[PDB]
Ligand binder design. Structure first.
Ligand SMILES: CC(=O)N[C@@H]1[C@@H](O)[C@H](O[C@@H]2O[C@H](CO)[C@@H](O[C@@H]3O[C@H](CO[C@H]4O[C@H](CO[C@H]5O[C@H](CO)[C@@H](O)[C@H](O)[C@@H]5O[C@H]5O[C@H](CO)[C@@H](O)[C@H](O)[C@@H]5O)[C@@H](O)[C@H](O)[C@@H]4O)[C@@H](O)[C@H](O[C@H]4O[C@H](CO)[C@@H](O)[C@H](O)[C@@H]4O)[C@@H]3O)[C@H](O)[C@H]2NC(C)=O)[C@@H](CO)O[C@H]1O
Ligand SMILES: CC(=O)N[C@@H]1[C@@H](O)[C@H](O[C@@H]2O[C@H](CO)[C@@H](O[C@@H]3O[C@H](CO[C@H]4O[C@H](CO[C@H]5O[C@H](CO)[C@@H](O)[C@H](O)[C@@H]5O[C@H]5O[C@H](CO)[C@@H](O)[C@H](O)[C@@H]5O)[C@@H](O)[C@H](O)[C@@H]4O)[C@@H](O)[C@H](O[C@H]4O[C@H](CO)[C@@H](O)[C@H](O)[C@@H]4O)[C@@H]3O)[C@H](O)[C@H]2NC(C)=O)[C@@H](CO)O[C@H]1O
Ligand SMILES: CC(=O)N[C@@H]1[C@@H](O)[C@H](O[C@@H]2O[C@H](CO)[C@@H](O[C@@H]3O[C@H](CO[C@H]4O[C@H](CO[C@H]5O[C@H](CO)[C@@H](O)[C@H](O)[C@@H]5O[C@H]5O[C@H](CO)[C@@H](O)[C@H](O)[C@@H]5O)[C@@H](O)[C@H](O)[C@@H]4O)[C@@H](O)[C@H](O[C@H]4O[C@H](CO)[C@@H](O)[C@H](O)[C@@H]4O)[C@@H]3O)[C@H](O)[C@H]2NC(C)=O)[C@@H](CO)O[C@H]1O
Lengths: 453, 128, 101, 126, 126, 126, 53, 53, 52
């Protein structure tokens, strides 16, 4: 009996940390969306009607969301997926032309600059033989003064080429699930006070993640899943100012946004098959794009982050909020899509506070672009067609990407500013619950047993 | 091989601003922050700030805020599109700003953080 | 802020010997970085994450430490090792230790 | 009782050696996205077959629990029976024996073919 | 006699249980078109392995016919031996037992691991 | 002694029948290039499974050496034991029996199902 | 009397390579493994319903 | 004295990215599983016939 | 040993947009001839080996 023998085990519950290609899952209503619009919903496998996540009792697991792959994988999947969509969509090669632009029909005070330039230009025809002078409307940001005529050009003309998104497509973020292969598990930190790094007591295996819709947005991140108890403020290295802070809200703060102008679209035959969607007459008043949030709730929720922040910087500390320091329009402003057009909302009004140790709304203005250069584009750009009519969207704010000032001097007055830049932060914000592991079922161990002769 | 090349030494009068350039090449310029740091005689190193080239987001040392501005320009050469230049402008100079200014970049290994600077420009001496 | 205090100010040793340099941080728990600056030359990263050697740094440089106490050890000193050495954590720096012959 | 796939993670190696057929079960069945699906579909059978490969080059195609003729080198663990089957978990246990698992496998490989080369001789004479 | 792959379709479950090695045989071996070939080539091994998976998590890796220790719940069929083996066909028979095949499989899964956990105890004492 | 994968190429069929677990071992685990990798990754499991397919439709899922009930037709070889096991090599031996290997396999196929259909009758009466 | 190619307003145009052929050559649709194709050998079948042969 | 690029009548032209390299780097041709590559280690082999080593 | 002795220069021409042709700019220094050198000694030696 004293002599022990190894006996092999198949089906042993043990895993090694891994990386692997996952795959997407979506629901039937995403295909019911039809209209040939949603990206990759079609090639994407379906979800489960009765999903199950088995809780694993008595086990702890060392998570780290700042050294994860499935957010790098996702970030990549999103960039690829998007870029494959633009291949069929028409090229605006000849739209790069010397425009002759003026201001839009308006009677505004001199201080208020003109942001809608009415531009006429020699465009191409269905026939190589001919040409056509035709006019369109452009935002001031989509053009640059070229040089007593007032002539302009599309801003991309010196940086990159341009390709018009098919209107028969949609930008709506629909929920994606990242399902593992066989013999691969995803482990889910069910602890409701986890900062994203270290041992998690409450853990569960699961095939696919939750419905993670790809909202690509700077400053405040929207429509995301929110915390269960406290407003959790997560970072890789909090002490170091170079690293950003991911704030995850507890309560949703609803923010309504809109383009008040009843814009119109005309279609211009580049020919043949090619067809540019110009911006036609503005029906009605010429107003300003903007977003509203409750000053009451913003007060309330900015009070929550401060209560949490003092747990890291001292009880007797001043924590005020300031606007962006300076940089690209991509990062100096709350960027998002709304109805199919891209927004650039001044966040100075939100981040303008001060906090001591112890009924209207916030109108915040916006800009709008059509030729966009997202994901740090370099050789290619994309013209987002005019969306006919009036546009308005309603969304919750789920989080923030804040940034602290490194001047320091041990001052109890370290202030914060909204940030963005790298878009992995957004998927980092939703994927903090998850980790991918490689299943290894072949156990070997001694029990008093010999195999027969 | 990563290379950071700065503009030459300069003499500045008090009240002046100095603009220092740092041409960065041998890697994808958008993928890494550039920091600026100054080595001051008899006082040692002082971190000035960083810039992230994608959006040009910046962070300035609290004690220098109001006197420093960082910007960048990305290559416009179609067959050589991945290098760029980082600029730092430092204003309201006094003799106490007489120092050697460096642009620096982190290492690109898995355990390399943001502040260990593996790559250094040759430095720019500014005498005020 | 973090205050880094290096010692000794000057260390006098011969080629072939081992130098030990110290850096005490005012706050514990962070990893340490070290640089070498030879007279009139660009600073060179030696150690990061407390004990990892940077690119092209020979193995006679050895970083270690824990809590608030950190060390750079230079084994079998070479003529080129005589220089000023600086420690760093985030944006904060020690004032340097000079290794002299 | 039925816990679920991996449910006996933090269970003792005795209790976890009950639910083996559950981990063994959910292990096979369960153009951008299209390629992801394909190199995940092969990865799962490659990874699966590599285990059947081992069980087969041993005698344990049964399988689950399978005894053998290679005796336990105390150097590998040296712990007593109770304190691994009624105490430790497989997550834990794996990291101890991890240093010699491939060396242990080699002992198994020779031992099986040795059985076959022998058993032919038995059926040969009888 | 040799009918062919699926030849005993309309044959009695007794006569069809003769030609099992023929259906089991023609089951593995046998850029537009290029992709079709690839996701058909994996589909065939995925579908094949999923059956070996079952036979293996039961005791029936033999295989073909394999007896077991789960007794026949009369509720499933309740027909007499003669009228299924010397009468009915598998096409027909499949649709009757179809309502509980996965429930039946579950009875098999527990029963096999139960055998193994037991047989170790026999070789342990002896 | 350990020669290596295929090392007993020019070794006698007796000595080569020792190192079987080595050739059986290195047989599984080990966008232009990306496609090459994929139709090589499937080819290896297809080719591998086609052998397990045969061993399984015979009784030899063991495997390595497996005796059977089909007697050796002298027409196939007719050589004496010594001059093939202690003389010839498998490279050589393969080309002799090559003319009837698939006919030989057929003898095996019927013989296995014949065993199963019989063994059920034994466990049936007992 | 001036004209245009009719496609010029509907679609773009791409000239087939003369080094290609339009001849319809016989194709067979083969199944994967563990998949069968069943063939109604009844010589009076209207395409829908039970086929004896 | 007027000229043209020589390709203009034979073929089209595409400028190689300078962000690419023409340096020949060593490649190894690895076999799949259950496939071997056999290597004539004879130091006087003309490439055709029986190789002892 | 092989070489192009001329210190050639490259200018970049904006075809636009995104497209950019790399022209050949001024030749800095002398205008010489591309060539390769091998040892006449070793070539003699190695051409003797092939003959044997
Ligand atoms: C502000 C912002 O930024 N947030 C937006 C947000 O606006 C929006 O979500 C909305 O928010 C608003 C405000 O928070 C919601 O408005 C409030 O809604 C309720 C409306 O009450 C509801 O039901 C009422 C009926 O009352 C009774 O009757 C039922 C049917 O007969 C019966 O089942 C019930 O028992 C019930 O109780 C009794 O009453 C009946 C008679 O009605 C009686 O016979 C029974 O026996 C019972 O005694 C009905 O009144 C109402 O229409 C609604 O269905 C209101 O109470 C609030 O009104 C008060 O405040 C108004 C301004 O705030 C003020 O004008 C009023 O005078 C009132 O004092 C208020 O409207 C709103 O529902 C919700 N809107 C939407 C679209 O869902 C979302 C949307 O995008 O985004 C945020 O970001
Ligand atoms: C500034 C910033 O960035 N912060 C914003 C923030 O503004 C905002 O939250 C708001 O903050 C402001 C300032 O901090 C709040 O304003 C203050 O509110 C109180 C208002 O007092 C309240 O009740 C008063 C009534 O007084 C009495 O009467 C009751 C009813 O009759 C009775 O129950 C009580 O007993 C009570 O006591 C006595 O008085 C009555 C008569 O009123 C008497 O008969 C009794 O017997 C008692 O003796 C009423 O006055 C008032 O409307 C309110 O309901 C005020 O005192 C403050 O006013 C003073 O300061 C003003 C400027 O600061 C100055 O103009 C005045 O002259 C006063 O000196 C002051 O307004 C505010 O309530 C709150 N606002 C909101 C919307 O909630 C939030 C919102 O987003 O965000 C932050 O970021
Ligand atoms: C042609 C072709 O395509 N082939 C090339 C090929 O050219 C080349 O290989 C070369 O080939 C050529 C021709 O085949 C060789 O040239 C010949 O070389 C010998 C040179 O004689 C050598 O030694 C001489 C010294 O003589 C004496 O002195 C020594 C030192 O003092 C002493 O040790 C000796 O004893 C020796 O004897 C006596 O002389 C001395 C005085 O010198 C005295 O005091 C003693 O007591 C003794 O009496 C010296 O002369 C010479 O430099 C060399 O070292 C010559 O004889 C040949 O010269 C004759 O022909 C010439 C043209 O063919 C003509 O011009 C002369 O007038 C002579 O008649 C001739 O040069 C050559 O060495 C060799 N070259 C090289 C580079 O190795 C290879 C190379 O790539 O490639 C082929 O493809």
């Amino acid at each position: 009996a004293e002599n022990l023998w190894v006996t092999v085990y198949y089906g042993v519950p043990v895993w090694k940390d891994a990386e692997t290609t996952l795959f997407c899952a979506s629901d039937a209503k995403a295909y019911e969306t039809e209209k040939h619009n949603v990206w990759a919903t079609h090639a994407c496998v379906p979800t489960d009607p009765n999903p199950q996540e088995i809780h694993l009792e008595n086990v702890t697991e060392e998570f780290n969301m700042w050294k994860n792959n499935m957010v790098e994988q996702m970030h990549t999947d999103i960039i690829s997926l998007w870029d494959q969509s633009l291949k069929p969509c028409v090229k605006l090669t000849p739209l790069c032309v010397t425009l002759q632009c003026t201001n839009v029909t308006n009677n505004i005070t001199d201080d208020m600059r003109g942001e809608l330039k009415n531009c006429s230009f020699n465009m191409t025809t269905e026939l190589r033989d001919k040409k056509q002078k035709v006019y369109s409307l452009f935002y001031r940001l989509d053009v640059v003064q070229i040089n007593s005529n007032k002539e302009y050009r599309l801003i991309n003309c010196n940086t990159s080429a341009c390709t018009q998104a098919c209107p028969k497509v949609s930008f709506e973020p629909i929920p994606i699930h990242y399902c593992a292969p066989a013999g691969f598990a995803i482990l889910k930190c069910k602890d409701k006070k986890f900062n994203g790094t270290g041992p998690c007591p409450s853990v569960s295996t699961v095939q696919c993640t939750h419905g993670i819709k790809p909202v690509v947005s700077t400053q405040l991140l929207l429509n995301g899943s929110l915390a269960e108890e406290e407003v959790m403020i997560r970072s890789e290295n909090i002490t170091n100012n170079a690293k950003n802070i991911l704030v995850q809200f507890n309560t949703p703060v609803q923010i309504n946004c809109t383009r008040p102008n009843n814009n119109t679209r005309k279609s211009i035959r580049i020919g043949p098959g090619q067809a540019f969607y110009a911006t036609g007459d503005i029906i009605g008043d010429i107003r300003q794009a903007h977003c509203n949030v409750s000053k009451a709730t913003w007060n309330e929720t900015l009070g929550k982050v401060v209560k949490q922040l003092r747990k890291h910087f001292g009880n007797n500390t001043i924590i005020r909020f300031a606007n962006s320091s300076g940089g690209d329009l991509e990062v100096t402003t709350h960027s998002f899509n709304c109805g199919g057009e891209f927004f650039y909302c001044n966040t100075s009004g939100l981040f303008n506070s001060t906090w001591i140790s112890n009924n209207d709304s916030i109108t915040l203005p916006c800009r709008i672009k059509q030729i966009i250069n997202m994901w740090q584009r370099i050789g290619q750009c994309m013209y987002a067609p005019p969306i006919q009519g009036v546009i308005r969207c309603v969304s919750n704010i789920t989080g923030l990407i804040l940034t602290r000032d490194g001047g320091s001097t041990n001052s109890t007055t370290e202030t914060f500013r909204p940030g963005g830049g790298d878009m992995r932060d957004n998927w980092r914000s939703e994927l903090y619950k998850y980790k991918v592991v490689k299943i290894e079922p072949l156990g070997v161990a001694p029990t008093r047993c010999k195999r027969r002769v | 091989q990563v290379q950071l090349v700065q503009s030459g030494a300069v003499i500045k009068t008090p009240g002046s601003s100095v603009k220092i350039s740092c041409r960065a090449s041998g890697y994808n310029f958008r993928d890494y922050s550039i920091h600026w740091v100054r080595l001051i005689p008899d006082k040692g190193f002082e971190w000035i700030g960083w810039i992230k080239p994608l959006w040009g987001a910046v962070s300035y040392a609290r004690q220098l805020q109001g006197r420093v501005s960082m910007t960048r320009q990305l290559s416009q050469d179609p067959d050589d599109p991945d290098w760029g230049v980082a600029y730092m402008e430092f204003s309201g100079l006094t003799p106490a700003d007489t120092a050697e200014y460096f642009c620096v970049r982190r290492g690109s290994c898995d355990y390399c953080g943001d502040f260990p600077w593996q790559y250094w420009c040759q430095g720019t001496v500014v005498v005020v | 802020e973090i205050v880094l205090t290096q010692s000794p100010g000057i260390l006098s040793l011969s080629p072939g010997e081992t130098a030990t340099l110290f850096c005490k941080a005012s706050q514990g728990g962070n990893a340490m970085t070290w640089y070498q600056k030879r007279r009139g030359q660009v600073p060179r990263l030696l150690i990061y994450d407390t004990s990892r050697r940077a690119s092209g740094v020979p193995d006679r440089f050895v970083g270690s430490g824990s809590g608030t106490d950190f060390f750079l050890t230079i084994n079998k000193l070479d003529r080129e090792d005589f220089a000023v050495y600086y420690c760093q954590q985030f944006e904060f720096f020690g004032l340097g230790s000079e290794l002299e012959v | 009782v039925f816990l679920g796939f991996l449910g006996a993670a933090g269970s003792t190696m005795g209790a976890a050696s009950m639910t083996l057929t559950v981990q063994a079960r959910n292990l096979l069945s369960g153009t951008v996205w299209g390629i992801k699906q394909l190199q995940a579909r092969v990865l799962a059978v490659e990874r699966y077959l590599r285990d059947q490969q081992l069980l087969g080059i041993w005698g344990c195609s049964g399988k689950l629990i399978c005894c053998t003729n290679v005796p336990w080198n105390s150097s590998w663990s040296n712990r007593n029976l109770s304190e691994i089957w009624d105490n430790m978990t497989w997550l834990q246990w794996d990291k101890e024996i991890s240093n010699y698992t491939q060396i242990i496998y080699g002992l198994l490989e020779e031992s099986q073919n040795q059985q076959e080369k022998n058993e032919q001789d038995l059926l040969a004479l009888d």
